[PDB]
Amino acid sequence: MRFILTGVPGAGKTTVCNKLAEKMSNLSVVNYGDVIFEEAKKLYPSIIQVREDTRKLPRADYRNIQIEAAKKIGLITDNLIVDTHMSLKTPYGFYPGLIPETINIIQPDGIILLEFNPRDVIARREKDRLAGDMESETDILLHQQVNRMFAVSYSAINQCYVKIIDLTWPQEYEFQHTEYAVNKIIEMLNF
Amino acid sequence: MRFILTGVPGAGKTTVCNKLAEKMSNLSVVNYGDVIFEEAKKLYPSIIQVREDTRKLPRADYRNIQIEAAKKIGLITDNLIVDTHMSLKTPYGFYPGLIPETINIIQPDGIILLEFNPRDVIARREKDRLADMESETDILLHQQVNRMFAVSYSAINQCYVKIIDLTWPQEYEFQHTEYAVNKIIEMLNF
Amino acid sequence: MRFILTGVPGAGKTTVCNKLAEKMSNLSVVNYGDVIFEEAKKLYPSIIQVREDTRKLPRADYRNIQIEAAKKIGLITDNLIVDTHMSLKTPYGFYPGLIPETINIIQPDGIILLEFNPRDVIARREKDRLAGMESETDILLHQQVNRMFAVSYSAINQCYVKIIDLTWPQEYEFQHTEYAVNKIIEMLNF
Ligand SMILES: [Cl-]
Ligand SMILES: [Cl-]
């Protein structure tokens, strides 16, 4: 099965993706931004050295590279988990990480939204910052509801599932959010 | 005029449909799930005996059946009211009840959402059971999701979105149903 | 750059536009409705005299005029700010202000939503009425729907969505308008 996994940045989605790769066999865990970076270096070796360079390209070339990455993802395997972002916040507002072509190509069975509590997100982002912009509770609640609207739109267009995993409850022990999300996702795949 | 009527399950949408079919003339009402069941028995008698059997079909066959059902619905009359669901909850998440083909075929003038209070929905669902047990948060989510789905379908197909508020407390039983029927009629005979 | 500016009616969206047109160089601010009205009197003088007369035209004629106006707007300038409405309320429900052709023609970089507090909007509308009546909940709904419409357009046409918050209390009159103008300018000169 194929699921696009998303959440607000730095909340622990990458932790879940890396931890999913160990526990599931014949499951592909892949980060969309990374494939975009690789194909951008391949097609524009001259310009692209750091992964921030994808910002600078012309939007037509960047969209072409997004399509190429969607193709590379499209044939990988049977079980896929695509780690990307419904939307990223910029000075000009929110911008979608996916283009319609990406979904048409990957043909995902579903979209998964990891919804955390804003306090946990702030504390986790500061924890990771200390280990190596500071948004407010309201900024993050917004970001999450907007991710929700984006996924529902993508579902209405491509007829795929919308699965909202709740991780807003208080942690009884550190890393319980990650474990619960991993277990729900696994439970979901092997149904 | 043509309106797709939706709400969360077991909330009283079917009652409103029955009462509209009674009070309204020159308007024919239909249940999408029932037509899907009929065409599934028609095209696949081997498998389809109960209306839950549609689950077992390959998704390609089920989509073909939805297409055929939409064709008959679109032809059925001039004024329509189609009882369907914006989205249904499954172990894999929410899934839209409509596919784009259904809307392109029926070309509804609008979509109508009956939005209830979760407490009313819980009490009504248990009342009907006596004649899964979701929580207030589950139901608020489901309805907000119905909202997003309807607005998306509107942006794509350039159609109306009418949200009927029934979250206020009932002064007498069956006032929600009455108010909804009256608003829908008022809207139709404009 | 091209931004479609939206908000609920009579909340001060037009004031933000007028003050921006005053403050920004090489910036043209234009109202979609006004171009629609002008081309409607030009092309259909018989029916169109007051700007409400746009109501009476056939929806085909109204759409053709919308296309002609969107053509004119995209043609009209370099730096643009288009004053419109994500959605308008009608007896049949909410209906979107933009058509797909409008966006394809204008190719806006983004959408901007001025989101107010319902009390501020109501009080501002009564202020404007007295100078020459929805409920708080009606307006919260209208705005959540505006939001959903903008997000849908965003997914379909890959444009920005900027939500400017004006629901805090005004410490002095015209602070909402001033803050919005400043945020938008800061955004433009990035
Ligand atoms: Cl019902
Ligand atoms: Cl205004």
The residues spanned by each domain of chain B are: 2-31+78-188
Q: Token pair of C3, please?
A: 């931004």
Task: For A2-31+79-189, give the CATH class.
Answer: alpha beta
Query: From ligand 2's centre to the CA of C187, what distance in Å?
Result: 21
Count of other CB atoms within 10 angstroms of residue A33: 15
DSSP string, C99-138: -HHHHHHH--SEEEEEEE-HHHHHHHHHHHHHT----HHH
C115 contact partners, CB below 8 Å, separation of at least 6: C7, C143, C146, C147, C163, C164, C165, C166, C167
Q: Does A67 touch chain C (CB under 8 A)?
A: no
The structure tokens 């008959």 sit at B72
Which of B108, B118, B92 minimizes the C-alpha distance to B8?
Answer: B118
**Contact check, Cβ <8 Å, B92/A161:** yes
- Is B2-31+78-188 a CATH 3.40.50.300 domain? yes
Q: Does A104 touch chain C (CB under 8 A)?
A: no
> Which residues, in sequence order, are bridge partners of residue A111?
A4, A162
Chain B CB contacts of A162 under 8 Å are 87, 93-95, 145
3-state secondary structure of C161: strand
Q: Report how far residue B115's alpha carbon sits from residue B109's, in angstroms, rounded to the nearest whole number.
A: 20
Contact B148, B161 (CB under 8 A): no
Q: Does B149 touch chain A (CB under 8 A)?
A: yes
Q: Using CB atoms, which residue from B95, B100, B148 is nearest to A161?
A: B95
Amino acid at residue number B121? V
Minimum-distance ligand to the CA of C9?
A: 2
Q: Using CB atoms, which residue from B91, B96, B156 is nearest to A155?
A: B96
Minimum-distance ligand to the CA of C180?
A: 2
Q: For chain A, how far is it from start to end, CA to CA, in angstroms?
A: 10
Rg of the Cα atoms in chain A: 17
Contact B69, B35 (CB under 8 A): yes
Ramachandran angles phi, psi of B4, nearest 5°: -90, 120
Rounded to 10 deg, the angle between the A137-158 and B136-157 helix axes is 60
Strand order in the sheet with A93-96: A87-90, A93-96, C160-166, C110-116, C2-7, C80-83, C28-31
Specify the DSSP class assigned to residue C56: G
* Strand pairing class (C80-83; B2-7): unpaired
**Contact check, Cβ <8 Å, A152/B153:** no
Q: Is C111 left (phi over 0), alpha (psi -120 to 50) or beta?
A: beta
Specify the DSSP class assigned to residue A98: -
Ramachandran angles phi, psi of C50, nearest 5°: -105, 160
Amino acid at residue number B36? I
Q: What is the resolution of this structure in A?
A: 3.6
Count of other CB atoms within 10 angstroms of residue B112: 26
**Contact check, Cβ <8 Å, B147/C144:** yes
Which of C16, C29, C33, C48 minimizes the C-alpha distance to C124?
Answer: C16
Tell me the CB-side half-sphere exposure of residue C41, using CA atoms within 13 A.
9
Q: How far out from the chain centre does Cα C183 lie?
A: 17
Q: Is the alpha carbon torsion for A52, A56, A57, A60 positive or negative? A: positive
Q: Report how far residue C73's alpha carbon sits from residue C75's, in angstroms, rounded to the nearest whole number.
A: 5
B129 contact partners, CB below 8 Å, separation of at least 6: none
Burial of C132 from C-beta contacts in 10 A (0-12 / 13-18 / 19+): exposed
Q: Using CB atoms, which residue from B93, B96, B100 is nearest to A110?
A: B93
Instruction: Please provide the size of chain A in residues.
Output: 191
Largest distance between two CA atoms of chain A = 50
Q: What angle do CA C101, C107, C113 make, to 5 degrees?
A: 95
* Strand pairing class (B93-96; B87-90): antiparallel
This structure was determined by X-ray
How close, in Å, is residue A113 to chain C by CA atoms?
16
C6 contact partners, CB below 8 Å, separation of at least 6: C13, C84, C85, C86, C97, C111, C112, C113, C114, C146, C150
CATH number of C2-25+80-188: 3.40.50.300
Q: Using CB atoms, which residue from C99, C145, C156 is nearest to B151?
A: C145
Count of other CB atoms within 10 angstroms of residue A53: 14
Instruction: Please provide the size of chain B in residues.
Output: 190
How close, in Å, is residue C101 to chain A by CA atoms?
18
**Contact check, Cβ <8 Å, B149/A155:** yes
Count of other CB atoms within 10 angstroms of residue A179: 12
Ramachandran angles phi, psi of C48, nearest 5°: -95, 105
Contact B183, B164 (CB under 8 A): yes
Contact C97, C88 (CB under 8 A): yes
Strand order in the sheet with A110-116: A27-31, A79-83, A2-6, A110-116, A161-167, B93-96, B87-90
